[PDB]
Amino acid sequence: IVGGESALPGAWPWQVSLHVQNVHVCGGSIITPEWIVTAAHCVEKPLNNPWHWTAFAGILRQSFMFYGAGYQVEKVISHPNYDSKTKNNDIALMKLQKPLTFNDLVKPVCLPNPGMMLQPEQLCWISGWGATEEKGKTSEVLNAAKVLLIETQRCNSRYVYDNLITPAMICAGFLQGNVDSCQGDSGGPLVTSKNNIWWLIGDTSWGSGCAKAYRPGVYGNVMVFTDWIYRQMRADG
Amino acid sequence: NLSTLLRLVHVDSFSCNNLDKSKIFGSCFNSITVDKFAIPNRRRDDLQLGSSGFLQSSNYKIDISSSSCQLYYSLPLVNVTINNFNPSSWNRRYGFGSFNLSSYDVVYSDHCFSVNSDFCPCADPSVVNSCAKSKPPSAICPAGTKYRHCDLDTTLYVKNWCRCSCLPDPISTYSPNTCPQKKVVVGIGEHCPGLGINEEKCGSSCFCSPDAFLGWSFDSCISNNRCNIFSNFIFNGINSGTTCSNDLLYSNTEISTGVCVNYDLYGITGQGIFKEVSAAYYNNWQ
């Protein structure tokens, strides 16, 4: 997050950070208290053995324990049609072995129903634990920023990406710069204000630097993969 | 003399701002500054007293809090020419030519851009060598000005992908802050420093293409076989200076012979009767 401010302890209970080898690598979001929605590029072959994974919830500053007080991941389900060259279909699901009962500052986000009729220049918000300005370290405190949704046709311009965005993937950010996520902001909850309820419609997959001109943010689209999550949840139970 | 001025010129409309037409007949002023330029037929309505048009923001701005009078007159099309010269300094430095347009056509500006001294629409060719996609032309910029800002960045798998600033054009760019060419508005009695130059068609010495200059148009100014030219009269001060008008003492300029009337001939006052007579004893100073 570049150009943002520190996130006050309000009500944002849809950000779960995954920790492996006692260090933070990638985050994620939760929709139901039985799964974890996160990116799929961190679930590669060297990142196997999901037993060595923990999840933290309701934790702003990442210092409250040491190799303990977490939720162990039982199984991880990734999208079968995942490509490592073009980075397409970068959505993975992690299942927890704990009931995860609802408590204070614990409230998931509902999936977006088909046919939302979203505005072209819709206002959204981002959050995560990444660098500060450029090639920095993991942020100790939680920060948030405000981004806008740009069109796919304008994102496919020859001077921006030259037609490198799939129809099942969208772009969000500012073309002027100074508002972008750096390396380490994997996943991240991208929600918007509509009908007094937030909708998770974004998922960070990759990116070309941060706070750079003609290089907006990259956030996946879950409107096409919404049925896949329901299918996996039905096949699991 | 205002009367002779309006008689010898085909005046179409004479209106002023913050000044009355009666107090300018016999008074004195300190100085008078006059500005004139052609009136395009497309932007003829933009010459009103206060408007956010292209003329009043790119070519010449008319002040409202000053005593300035606007004069609209016409000129015959016989033995008339139009001079289209670019007052820009940095544009002609890189080899700016002429518009090469037909006669009886004027050039008006719609988007003016201001740049600093450290500016060069040219890139260092030693850096553009490691570029494969959207490779901009480069040449040797003269000393004293930095080269074009271009960076090498990889998005997914393209190693040789170079991006520069001012894309696609400085008129409508996605990041005006990164591009040094910024839009400027002319002030009271100020010219436009220069127009936008497309960096994709520039570049031996850095020579931009003549077709890369954008942000201007052209249109005829012929109306009823006559050309329209604007005129602005600005009066500095009132009831002062040494610039007066002869609209009072030269009222009749005709004398009678046979009746008695007063006279103020050359500071001599009195009354008497006149009579024509042939005299040949006067000199050039008597």
From Swiss-Prot, chain A:
Active site: H41, D90, S186
Record annotation: effect of changing K212A: No effect on catalytic activity. Reduces HKU1-CoV viral entry
Consequence recorded when altering Q176A: No effect on catalytic activity or HKU1-CoV viral entry
Mutagenesis or variant effect for D162 to A/N: No effect on catalytic activity. Almost abolishes HKU1-CoV viral entry
Cysteine disulfide partners in this protein: C26-C42, C155-C171, C182-C210
Consequence when changing S157 to A/N: No effect on catalytic activity. Reduces HKU1-CoV viral entry
Residue spans, topological domain Extracellular: 2-237
Source organism superkingdom: Eukaryota
Resulting phenotype, N178A: No effect on catalytic activity or HKU1-CoV viral entry
Outcome of substituting R61A: No effect on catalytic activity or HKU1-CoV viral entry
Residues of the Peptidase S1 domain: 2-237
Outcome (variant: L164 to R/A/M): No effect on catalytic activity. Abolishes HKU1-CoV viral entry
Residues covered by region (HKU1-CoV S protein-binding): 85-215
Subcellular location: Secreted
Name of the protein described by the UniProt record: Transmembrane protease serine 2 catalytic chain
Whole-protein residues included: 257 to 492 of 492
From Swiss-Prot, chain B:
Positions annotated as glycosylated: N1, N79, N100
Residue ranges constituting the BetaCoV S1-CTD domain according to the UniProt record: 1-246
Disulfide bonds: C16-C69, C28-C244
Function: Attaches the virion to the cell membrane by interacting with host receptor, initiating the infection.
Official protein name in the record: Spike protein S1
Protein source organism: Human coronavirus HKU1 (isolate N5) (HCoV-HKU1)
